[PDB]
Amino acid sequence: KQVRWCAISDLEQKKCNDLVGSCNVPDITLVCVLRSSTEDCMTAIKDGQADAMFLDSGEVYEASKDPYNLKPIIAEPYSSNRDLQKCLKERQQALAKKMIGHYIPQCDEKGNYQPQQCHGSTGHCWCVNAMGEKISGTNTPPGQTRATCERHELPKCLKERQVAFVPQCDEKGNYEPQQFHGSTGYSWCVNAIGEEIAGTKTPPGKIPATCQKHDLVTTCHYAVAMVKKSSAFQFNQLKGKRSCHSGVSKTDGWKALVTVLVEKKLLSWDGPAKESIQRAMSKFFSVSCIPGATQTNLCKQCKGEEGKNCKNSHDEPYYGNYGAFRCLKEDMGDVAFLRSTALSDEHSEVYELLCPDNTRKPLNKYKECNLGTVPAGTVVTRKISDKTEDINNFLMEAQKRQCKLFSSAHGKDLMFDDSTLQLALLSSEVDAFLYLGVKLFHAMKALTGDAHLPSKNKVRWCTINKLEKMKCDDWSAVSGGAIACTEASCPKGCVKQILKGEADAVKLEVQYMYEALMCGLLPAVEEYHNKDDFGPCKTPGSPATDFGTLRAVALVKKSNKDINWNNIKGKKSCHTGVGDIAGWVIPVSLIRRQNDNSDIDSFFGESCAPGSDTKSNLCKLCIGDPKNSAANTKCSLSDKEAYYGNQGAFRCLVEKGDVAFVPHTVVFENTDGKNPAVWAKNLKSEDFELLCLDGSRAPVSNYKSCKLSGIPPPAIVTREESISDVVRIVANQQSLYGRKGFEKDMFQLFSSNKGNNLLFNDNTQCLITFDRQPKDIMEDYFGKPYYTTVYGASRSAMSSELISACTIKHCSNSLEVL
């Protein structure tokens, strides 16, 4: 009902009151809370006095910590080569605007961009490629011969796949990060456009380099040092000069400059624990104006009045990008560190850029002469996110109603960056780490001083609940300083902690492994489930045969001698539940591969897959709690469904179905005497058979040959630098607390009184070292069958916030490179 915005200056407050008066959003009211600086507004948000503000990307990490504890919620989205159906999305977005006579993108039937676009209000038309980018020079006014627009829709990857070294592309025509030559057998990592990255080409037999996924984005902004052409100094002579900065906490005015000076060895500075950054900067520069600084000489050149001087606010006339430009223009400084947004063509006559390679270049060369890319700022609110919905509603409705959010006659960059075109909602999972990305997050963490000192003799194991925390505390109190414990809410959180330098290793099931292998983590050891062959456990060197791996199989009755694999379409099937690997992932993936129609909801007849739509075909013949007529628990994801799990899928197969998709272990578990005594009382394993991929059938005990696919074992993952330590520490702890260790009388790693299946599955025998084979790490862990079947041998089969945080953003002028 009410959204309070925190303004850091009087100009921001004037713009805020203007927006309060003019912008009318129904059911939401804008309130302007005035503070004197950015830190004061962050504190007011932390105290509940305000609801949201805009922060530079260099202020997000320090905002996610005490004494602020804020999180980004809304940010400006970038255009990339991963945008799917951009035309439909942008057309809906334009139609949702309360305005007449604006450009609504025209799309065809399939949802692609029409090669010719037209602004119906003005009559202008132009040509456009697959991503909606205007072909240069094709803008024609009304009454003039139009430019004949052809079809620029073929990605470079498939164009190089023709006329033929044959590269691998994903299902959307983008370059796969890893490239494998067929004739010579080499492996190398490539750019977002297919350019080979240096230092990655590895001959065969050698383990290939871990390739990182790349995305190509447009409209990038940079941090630049701007000088007057009348000056004569270079970059390595900045010491003793007078500088102007946009702000002490901004990337484009501080962080990037400090990083460059530390790299180029210009800044005599020990470290964050030994000396403050501001003190080294005060010793480096002469008099300067750096808003927010706490050293006197760093505020000497500022022009604010008493009480307003050197404050992180527009009350200081030298604050921000344009503030630093004004500080340089009035000869209060010799160089100005700001963003590429403040650059204009009216300045190229008097001003130029100061490149870190000790040369000077014009302004229009900022893409080749900068201190680094600067991500966009964010709207931040409290980490508890009590007002995120109202803030998002107000901002989206203000964008729909064309309110003057990103411009003002009072000044530049008030409230938001004036370069901002559109604000979109970020996923609630996004924090400072998931927003900045792994590399930038760790850079900010090292700059602030929170860089963890790695220990080569202690492993920080991550837990996912309190029972695992208690088991880990036992293991740590008995480990003798070799094991410590961190707490997370889910295995995804454990992977995030490992990527943040806060944890060291964690056991992941196969479903969590893809992302883990996509972010650079490697498997250190693997669980060994073979309850028979001991030897690869007691004397490390005995070659392992069967890892106890579960084999996904399609079980049918020997009564029904018509169900083959080449006709499964239409029959009633049984699944263990939506999400299970052998009970859903393998069969659905295989079906979507084989039959190109790709519609599982209509593929089968009345299958029972617990967790699907109650009204769809995938939730029939599911007897949900027969005794409980006081609730409808049909097709439930829990034990309240009689056909849930392996036992439930076998029940469905025995009672009403024709085929079931289960691991091979269910049959022997629910037949041959060892079975329960309610339904499986006189059932024999010879009364069933397995469907094979060749349309044939086999006895149940042939699960190693007549299998849908194999399931990889759960893998303990860690960073690459910690593999050598984690593996041997696991071996040392296993020689003491394993199934056949020295001191099992104190702690067993594979069982606990605190609970079952904590840290490791109780049925596990031991933890074998992962032998990294010289091929794709994805294909090495998953195995080529699982890789190709489920993820299509591609690194684009899935997408999430973590993978986006682990992707490199390859800046570009446009996506026109195709």
UniProtKB/Swiss-Prot annotation:
Q: Which Cys-Cys disulfides exist here?
A: C6-C41, C16-C32, C87-C107, C118-C125, C127-C149, C157-C169, C189-C211, C244-C327, C289-C302, C299-C310, C355-C369, C462-C494, C472-C485, C519-C806, C537-C766, C574-C652, C608-C622, C619-C635, C692-C706
Source superkingdom:
Eukaryota
Q: Which residues form the Transferrin-like domain?
A: 3-83, 212-449, 459-795
> Which keywords describe this protein according to UniProt?
Disulfide bond, Repeat, Secreted, Signal
- Which InterPro entries does the entry mention? Thyroglobulin_1, Thyroglobulin_1_sf, Transferrin, Transferrin-like_dom
Entry's localization field: Secreted
According to its record, what are the GO cellular component terms?
early endosome; extracellular space; plasma membrane; recycling endosome
- Alphabetized Pfam families for the sequence: Thyroglobulin_1, Transferrin
Entry comment describing in which tissues the protein is expressed: Plasma. Highest levels of transcripts found in the liver, the lung, the pancreas and the brain.
Residue ranges of domain Thyroglobulin type-1 in the record: 84-149, 154-211
Q: Which GO terms describe its biological process?
A: antibacterial humoral response; iron ion transport
Write out the ranges of the annotated region (Absent in transferrins): 86-216
What PANTHER family does the annotation carry? SEROTRANSFERRIN, TRANSFERRIN
The family note in this entry says: Belongs to the transferrin family.
Function, as annotated, reads: Binds specifically to the neurotoxin saxitoxin. Its physiological role may be to transport or sequester an endogenous organic molecule other than Fe(3+). It may participate in a detoxification mechanism for neutralizing a microbial toxin.
**Assembly description:** Monomer.
Q: What is this protein called?
A: Saxiphilin
This protein's species is Aquarana catesbeiana (American bullfrog)
